[PDB]
């Protein structure tokens, strides 16, 4: 299954300028990074290179509008949602996570099975709006700085 | 203002592996083609390609990965929502429409200002869908019955 990890405020903002409107949240950062640590990740090309020191999962399916060969042996290039899913399927992935950024989210949201949202309580980039009546809140653990929600399709 | 125009059955289906899944409705097509007639139209490369004999507004902002040469005097290229708004800002346009396909409606949904949606009335089988939208975020500006569909104009809250 296809699932996205995202931390977003009440107005659905995920980013202002470049990154976070909000400050600290290491509770959040421990959480998501543990979550995706052993399964394939799907990410924008700039987020990939913004994490060259500490790469996000089992592998990385990198969304590029351009053909790219990578340094890392675990990095892959996908040009579409379909191609990404095929790469993860060739990896024998059980699940693959969509961690950012905004264009990638919008793009994958129609194909998403589950959503691990960190509800944070003014910006330009956004997490896509979902139908509240067509997703069941599977879990809602209260945490430090935010409140983690896993949302499944009905 | 960015505004989409789409026709979907119940299930939000907008197609089946090539074309419309529902048959007739030329009152849809007349009103949709005339709607977008003069303003710029945001659309995909394959949707543009297929529409080459007709072509929907006065200038077409073609959303594609590849940087492409287009020998059509006004049919621009875009690699993002942002670039696509810049180019319509450049053409002095008031309104920019998203004609789609499915991936493009998705990419433009968090930026939309309006949705102009024709609700074709039965359930159909498909594979390409128009995106879901939160009930709390959108207000229904108007809704009219016509033959074979009902056009809805949804403004954001």
Swiss-Prot record, chain A:
Pathway: Cofactor biosynthesis; tetrahydrofolate biosynthesis; 5,6,7,8-tetrahydrofolate from 7,8-dihydrofolate: step 1/1
Regulation: Activity unstable at KCl and NaCl concentrations lower than 2 M and activity increases with increasing concentrations of KCl or NaCl.
Gene Ontology CC terms: cytosol
Any Gene Ontology biological process: one-carbon metabolic process
Domain of life: Archaea
Residues holding substrate: 28
Database matches in InterPro entries: DHFR, DHFR-like_dom_sf, DHFR_CS, DHFR_dom
Domain DHFR, residue spans: 1-154
Pfam families given in the database record: DHFR_1
Alphabetically ordered keywords of this record: NADP, One-carbon metabolism, Oxidoreductase
Role of this protein: Key enzyme in folate metabolism. Catalyzes an essential reaction for de novo glycine and purine synthesis, and for DNA precursor synthesis.
Entry protein name: Dihydrofolate reductase HdrA
Species whose genome carries this gene: Haloferax volcanii (strain ATCC 29605 / DSM 3757 / JCM 8879 / NBRC 14742 / NCIMB 2012 / VKM B-1768 / DS2)
From Swiss-Prot, chain B:
Catalytic reaction annotation: (6S)-5,6,7,8-tetrahydrofolate + NADP(+) = 7,8-dihydrofolate + NADPH + H(+)
Domain DHFR per the UniProt entry, residue ranges: 1-157
Domain of life: Archaea
Record-listed E.C. numbers: 1.5.1.3
Pathway: Cofactor biosynthesis; tetrahydrofolate biosynthesis; 5,6,7,8-tetrahydrofolate from 7,8-dihydrofolate: step 1/1
GO terms under biological process: dihydrofolate metabolic process; folic acid metabolic process; one-carbon metabolic process; tetrahydrofolate biosynthetic process
UniProt note on regulation of activity: Activity unstable at KCl and NaCl concentrations lower than 2 M and activity increases with increasing concentrations of KCl or NaCl.
Residues involved in NADP(+) binding: 7, 13-19, 46-47, 66-67, 100-107
Family: Belongs to the dihydrofolate reductase family.
Name this protein carries in UniProt: Dihydrofolate reductase HdrA
Protein source organism: Haloferax volcanii (strain ATCC 29605 / DSM 3757 / JCM 8879 / NBRC 14742 / NCIMB 2012 / VKM B-1768 / DS2)
């Amino acid at each position: 299954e296809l699932v996205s990890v995202a931390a977003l405020a009440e107005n659905r903002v995920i980013g202002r300028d470049g990154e976070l409107p909000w400050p600290s949240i290491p509770a959040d950062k421990k959480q998501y990074r543990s979550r995706i640590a052993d399964d394939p990740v799907v990410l924008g090309r700039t987020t990939f290179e913004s994490m060259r020191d500490d790469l996000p999962g089992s592998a990385q399916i990198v969304m590029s509008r351009s053909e790219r060969s990578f340094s890392v042996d675990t990095a892959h290039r996908a040009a579409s949602v379909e191609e990404a899913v095929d790469i993860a399927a060739s990896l024998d992935a059980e699940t693959a996570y969509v961690i950012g950024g905004a264009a990638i989210y919008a793009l994958f949201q129609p194909h998403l099975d589950r959503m691990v949202l960190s509800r944070v309580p003014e910006g330009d980039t956004y997490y896509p709006e979902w139908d509240a009546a067509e997703w069941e809140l599977d879990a809602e653990t209260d945490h430090e700085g935010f409140t983690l929600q896993e949302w499944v399709r009905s």
